[PDB]
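Milestone M4 deliverable, item 7.
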Amino acid sequence: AKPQIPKDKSKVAGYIEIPDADIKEPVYPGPATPEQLNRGVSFAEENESLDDQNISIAGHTFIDRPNYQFTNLKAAKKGSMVYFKVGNETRKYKMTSIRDVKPTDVGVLKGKDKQLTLITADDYNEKTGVWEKRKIFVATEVK
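Output delivered:
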């Protein structure tokens, strides 16, 4: 009954939408490596589960194309609606105040309201397997 994330990294797992920022993107399986983000927005981790309290999704910030992936995500303010479609359901969330923040460099983020952590990523470092430039945007489940 539960929605599943494709084992084949090349298949679209879902759709993420953020109207205030004009973002509508097919979400692909993780981890979020250059190749996956080359296909499109993708789950940050290979382990991700659509049943987690926190689901992480990462996208590029390529300011050459204002509207490429999560480049314009900063245009989404508090209260902004976020839609995450996964086959059988459309989950709605609202952007909280935790947005456009350095990962644990300024903030921090169980038994808590389901949320979505959208991540803008750039500067991938092959030696460490880390995107060096990242901004966090947390949206909280509505219904």
